[PDB]
From Swiss-Prot, chain C:
Disulfide bonds join 43-51. The gene is S. The lineage of its organism: Viruses, Riboviria, Orthornavirae, Pisuviricota, Pisoniviricetes. Residues 11-19 are annotated as: Immunodominant HLA epitope recognized by the CD8+. Changing residue 53 to L: Increased resistance to neutralizing antibodies and human covalescent sera neutralization. It comes from the Viruses. This is Spike protein S1.
Length: 228, 289, 97
């Protein structure tokens, strides 16, 4: 299945205040009226992280609880694991071996090795969630926006949340799910466990020129793609 | 005077009747202020040298630093400070340098043997137990604390290694129990003559000399890998004056201009605002926000 | 300059200074060498209480690598403006036409 993303994927590229002027930015943005992959949670395959992925999800029970990043799923090279919880998030880049299926919260699916980096911050989490991941300049950027509510037609600019100095090579990524009372093995089947009925979206970024319209308070009210 | 400057700007000794643009007036700045955010994540070297537990010579730990702000100027309050021969980098300029990650090597060394751990040296523990490279960036932190960590009944808990047949390359370890091989001899598996097993121990005494004293040697090492630097040193002093033509420097962006109170409501993720046609209009205070 | 100046157990007559209070202006020199410190504590702190003697002796041997062998460097200072000059090559003259 596919869904066309109407006016989503617009974030703050320069982190500066501009009052009532229009800026032509040449960066990586999601083009308007482009198709995204649509999935239903009620097993997920691996998806390529080419040069940036716009993530979108409309949930009502908080079933997705993070992501996995890294150029390989094995323990030969450093992968990334972000898992969210009810109180805090832990960002953890240290190359643990993962299973063929992500974990369902069995609160551990990782082994020990050389471990490097760890991060504590504020918690990242009908309810609509959008996330953009980027790695061009060796800095991990996440732009997020939570709006109460297929995808709606309302425009919404996405504010930057964190900015990590890790510069790990990322080629592949994988989403996380959570289910009540789920035990997992090193060898998994395709059955799984029952969860709430919801859906999530995955987009792709391309380098496009965007004329963002800034408001009086520095907010992005509208955006125009050049090659649309 | 502005009459002769008008004769200077037109290159003629006689000027005629009329208005002439001679120069441009510009106010020179009086002060210069730099500001930086607070020292929130202070560096935990207090676990390293202010601790009471310490490691042995061969059983040294390696404790790494990921994200912190550094402070080496307050570390000189210690009384047994006597050795700080730094390697490659002067100790004054290290406070402005910003590196990626810091590793510490914590152990105890015989006080007569502290001169062997140096670039371009040979000795007992230098070629066989622990060596630093010649491209090393860091210094040694050595001090005597025999008043606190010893008793008259025998402080031989800190062990050491005298010799082995091979030469350990740096940046690895060995807790290997290996038998001495002198020549035409098989391995028995138990100690005795010509089976000199290298499990040794020092002779720590509180009155044991003044030059043969325990020197708690901490060799702190700095590494760069052509990466964006994370470990920042102790920053410059933060001072602020308003309504005066001063030099502003708020995490970069050096220039000249006055500072006035504003009225708009900015978003919290914004750091510095830019006006039309790429001119910096407003930069928020990194300290008082 | 390895065969001429580098000595075993010696070669300490050449000195080098590790710090200075400020960057010296070009084509200037200094001879007096009192001990400078951080300012809030007096001099003669050569034991290691944040004071250093500036002129240090190197005293290296030819067993070292190529990065720290003594190189006898000589810099030539020139000024090529228009002025009465009397120092150049042996190129002969030619009678005036
Ligand atoms: C663990 O990672 C560090 C830095 O990423 C590296 O220096 C070390 O060699 C690694 N250890 C392995 C691959 O066994
Ligand atoms: C990063 O991964 C891609 C794809 O696996 C590879 O082509 C590239 O050489 C890698 N870069 C580095 C620096 O490892
Ligand atoms: C900008 O913010 C002020 C203060 O909250 C508000 O009064 C004003 O209506 C806002 N303007 C717009 C266009 O949102
Ligand atoms: C660490 O030691 C120094 C030197 O005595 C002291 O000033 C400092 O307060 C100590 N830090 C602690 C006890 O946390
Ligand atoms: C920095 O410290 C000062 C004084 O403790 C405080 O008023 C200010 O809010 C702090 N700023 C930040 C960003 O924590
Ligand atoms: C003259 O001496 C002063 C004081 O030592 C010094 O700062 C200055 O650089 C010297 N100038 C020259 C040309 O040597």
């Amino acid at each position: 299945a596919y869904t066309n993303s109407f006016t989503r994927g617009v974030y703050y590229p320069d982190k500066v205040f501009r009052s009532s002027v229009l800026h032509s930015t040449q960066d990586l943005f999601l083009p308007f009226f482009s198709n995204v992959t649509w999935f239903h949670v009620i097993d997920n395959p691996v998806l390529p992280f080419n040069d940036g992925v716009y993530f979108a999800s409309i949930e009502k029970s908080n079933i997705i609880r993070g992501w996995i990043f890294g150029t390989t799923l094995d323990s030969k090279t450093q992968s990334l694991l972000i898992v969210n919880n009810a109180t805090n998030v832990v960002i953890k880049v240290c190359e643990f071996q993962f299973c063929n299926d992500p974990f369902l919260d069995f609160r551990v699916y990782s082994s020990a090795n050389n471990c490097t980096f760890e991060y504590v911050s504020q918690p990242f989490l009908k309810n609509l969630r959008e996330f953009v991941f980027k790695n061009i300049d060796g800095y991990f950027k996440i732009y997020s926006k939570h709006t109460p509510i297929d995808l709606p037609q309302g425009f919404s600019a996405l504010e930057p949340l964190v900015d990590l100095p890790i510069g790990i090579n990322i080629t592949r990524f994988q989403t996380l799910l959570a289910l009540h009372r789920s035990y997992l093995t090193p060898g998994d089947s395709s059955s799984g466990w029952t969860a709430g009925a919801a859906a999530y979206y995955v987009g792709y970024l391309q380098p496009r020129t965007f004329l963002l319209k800034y408001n009086e308070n520095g907010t992005i009210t509208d955006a125009v793609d050049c090659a649309l | 005077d502005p009459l002769s400057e008008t004769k200077c700007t037109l290159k003629s000794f006689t000027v005629e009747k009329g208005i002439y643009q001679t120069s441009n007036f510009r106010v020179q700045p009086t002060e210069s202020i730099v500001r930086f955010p607070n020292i929130t994540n202070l560096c935990p070297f207090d676990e390293v040298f202010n601790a009471t537990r310490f490691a042995s010579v061969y059983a040294w730990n390696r404790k790494r630093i990921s994200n912190c702000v550094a402070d080496y100027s307050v570390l000189y309050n210690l009384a047994p400070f006597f050795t700080f021969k730094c390697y490659g980098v002067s100790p004054t300029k290290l406070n402005d340098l910003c590196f990626t990650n810091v590793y510490a090597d914590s152990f105890v060394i015989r006080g007569d043997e502290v001169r062997q751990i140096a670039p371009g040296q040979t000795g007992n523990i230098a070629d066989y137990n622990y060596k630093l490279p010649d491209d090393f960036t860091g210094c040694v932190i050595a001090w005597n604390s025999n008043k606190l960590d010893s008793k008259v009944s025998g402080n031989y808990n800190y062990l050491y290694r005298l010799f082995r047949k091979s030469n350990l390359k740096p940046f690895e370890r060995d807790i290997s129990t290996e038998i001495y091989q002198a020549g035409n001899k098989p391995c028995n598996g138990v100690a005795g003559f010509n089976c000199y097993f290298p499990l040794r121990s020092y002779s720590f005494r509180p009155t044991y000399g003044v030059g043969h004293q325990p020197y708690r040697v901490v060799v702190l090492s700095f590494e760069l890998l052509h990466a964006p630097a994370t470990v920042c040193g102790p920053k410059k002093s933060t001072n602020l004056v308003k309504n005066k033509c001063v030099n502003f420097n708020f995490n970069g962006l050096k220039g000249t201009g006055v500072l006035t109170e504003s009225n708009k409501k900015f978003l919290p993720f914004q750091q510095f605002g830019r006006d039309i046609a790429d001119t910096t209009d407003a930069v928020r205070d990194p300290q008082t926000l």
